[PDB]
Amino acid sequence: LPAGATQERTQKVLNEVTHYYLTKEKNNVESVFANNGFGFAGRGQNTG
Amino acid sequence: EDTPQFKIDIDQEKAQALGVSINDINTTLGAAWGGSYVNDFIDRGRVKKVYVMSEAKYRMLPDDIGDWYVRAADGQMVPFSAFSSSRWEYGSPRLE
Amino acid sequence: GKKLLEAARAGRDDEVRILMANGADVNAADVVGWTPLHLAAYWGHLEIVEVLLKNGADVNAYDTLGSTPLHLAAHFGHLEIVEVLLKNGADVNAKDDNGITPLHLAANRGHLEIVEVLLKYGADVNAQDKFGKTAFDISINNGNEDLAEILQ
Amino acid sequence: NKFQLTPVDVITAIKAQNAQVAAGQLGGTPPVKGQQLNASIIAQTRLT
Amino acid sequence: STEEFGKILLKVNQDGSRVLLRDVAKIELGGENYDIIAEFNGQPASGL
């Protein structure tokens, strides 16, 4: 997410992500583990 | 096996009332009955410890608890029997 | 006496009701003043309380700080033992060396049933400890809504 | 001595005014519903 | 417990009324920090 973007804003996005895998990849995806707060580029409320 | 042990409770309200800080209370109890490593001194060129502890005859039985005093913020000396209640209970002398 | 103190601590039914037949002292007290009846009220052995009391055990014996078996049992939620003690004449308002009563101890832990059994047997609800605290003052200080109402 | 000061007070003042402070975050976690702003709160920093 | 922390005596007023910790705060078991939201298929999850 952009700079300073909040926790609740990231979570709506990760839920849109998890909803895609479990619906439109229902044949192939077993489970999705989302982590809001830390990423490859670093930590912050705006990375997941 | 578990052994009897002397539970002593500090009344937070009465201590607060008398102007007697809890730190004055606890460090007095501990340094008297448990003793306290205070600092070091040099005994014949060799650095060694300095413990303060009550003399034996004043830390033997529950009656001796009363003979210890703490100063209040107003400057008056208050005995332990003023802000403490005490009972008996059992506990382990060696937790595995 | 020494074998009865440790047998009533461990809770061996047969061994207390054989030591009693061997003339063991019901009121033999350890170094802190705890009789076999103090031990059984502390540890919750209901049936050793009933064997000792009918063998002449001092129901209102107090330790080297003034604690009676009724104090111990009312403190740690032994309801059936509080009733058996009171049925054998337990001092419902006994005062230890701090002024604490069985009603105070039972009120601090929130034992609603032992408080109602002590009050039924006539516990002084306005009895004060050494700090002037009643069973009620304990209740408001602990935030106990249920018990603050039972204590008048 | 002109201003009734000692090294004690100098050291105290340097300790008070040359320091770094943990100040938390605007919209810090845990946040409230619909927080849209999350930002580092910057308190006192080291002198330079 | 939360109750024992609740009855911490902060202050005895002049009229005697005791200011308790629960009177000025809410008290609960909680996380050490709340910076990470971990979800497994959108359900609450922790892990190793």
Side-chain angles (χ1 to χ4, degrees), chain C residues 47-131:
Chain C
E47 79 296 350
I48 285 182
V49 168
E50 292 178 308
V51 162
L52 288 173
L53 281 173
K54 71 168 67 66
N55 279 301
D58 183 4
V59 66
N60 290 342
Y62 51 73
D63 68 4
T64 56
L65 284 175
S67 187
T68 67
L70 179 59
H71 279 102
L72 297 178
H75 197 186
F76 303 120
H78 300 304
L79 172 66
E80 69 297 321
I81 294 173
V82 161
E83 284 183 288
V84 161
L85 283 175
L86 294 174
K87 281 164 67 182
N88 287 249
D91 172 9
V92 73
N93 299 306
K95 288 194 153 302
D96 73 348
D97 292 358
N98 316 289
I100 303 175
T101 62
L103 185 72
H104 285 130
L105 289 181
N108 198 358
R109 251 65 177 183
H111 297 309
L112 303 188
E113 280 216 65
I114 288 177
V115 164
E116 286 185 356
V117 158
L118 289 177
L119 285 175
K120 182 60 176 72
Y121 188 73
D124 191 344
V125 73
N126 300 311
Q128 299 183 5
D129 69 0
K130 67 187 292 184
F131 305 115

Side-chain angles (χ1 to χ4, degrees), chain B residues 1-4 6-7 9 11 13-14 62 80-91, chain C residues 9 30-32 34 39 42-43 63-65 67 72 75 96 98 100 105 109 130-131 133 141:
Chain B
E1 291 310 297
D2 300 357
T3 80
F6 177 78
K7 179 73 182 198
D9 278 346
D11 196 72
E13 186 178 4
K14 190 67 188 179
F80 263 90
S81 49
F83 47 76
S84 68
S85 57
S86 57
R87 292 193 297 274
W88 288 111
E89 53 186 52
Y90 278 67
Chain C
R9 178 184 158 184
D30 67 5
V31 296
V32 293
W34 284 39
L39 269 299
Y42 184 82
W43 294 113
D63 68 4
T64 56
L65 284 175
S67 187
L72 297 178
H75 197 186
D96 73 348
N98 316 289
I100 303 175
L105 289 181
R109 251 65 177 183
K130 67 187 292 184
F131 305 115
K133 301 300 189 185
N141 200 66

Side-chain angles (χ1 to χ4, degrees), chain D residues 3-23:
Chain D
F3 304 108
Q4 293 79 247
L5 295 175
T6 64
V8 170
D9 313 296
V10 168
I11 289 174
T12 309
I14 298 163
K15 279 190 172 185
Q17 301 182 56
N18 178 50
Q20 195 75 33
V21 163

Side-chain angles (χ1 to χ4, degrees), chain B residues 39-91:
Chain B
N39 60 10
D40 307 353
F41 79 115
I42 306 173
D43 174 14
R44 293 162 290 178
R46 185 166 167 117
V47 55
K48 307 182 181 166
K49 294 195 165 54
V50 179
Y51 282 80
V52 305
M53 181 169 205
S54 168
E55 184 179 352
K57 75 161 77 68
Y58 312 108
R59 55 170 179 73
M60 281 293 105
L61 295 179
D63 302 63
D64 306 344
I65 293 284
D67 305 295
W68 285 101
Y69 291 75
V70 186
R71 196 196 305 108
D74 63 9
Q76 296 189 85
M77 301 300 312
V78 182
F80 263 90
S81 49
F83 47 76
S84 68
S85 57
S86 57
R87 292 193 297 274
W88 288 111
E89 53 186 52
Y90 278 67

Side-chain angles (χ1 to χ4, degrees), chain D residues 15-47:
Chain D
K15 279 190 172 185
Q17 301 182 56
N18 178 50
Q20 195 75 33
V21 163
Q25 300 186 3
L26 295 187
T29 71
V32 306
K33 223 173 170 63
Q35 182 65 4
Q36 281 297 282
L37 167 66
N38 168 236
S40 294
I41 298 180
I42 315 299
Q44 298 170 229
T45 73
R46 301 281 202 183
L47 306 187

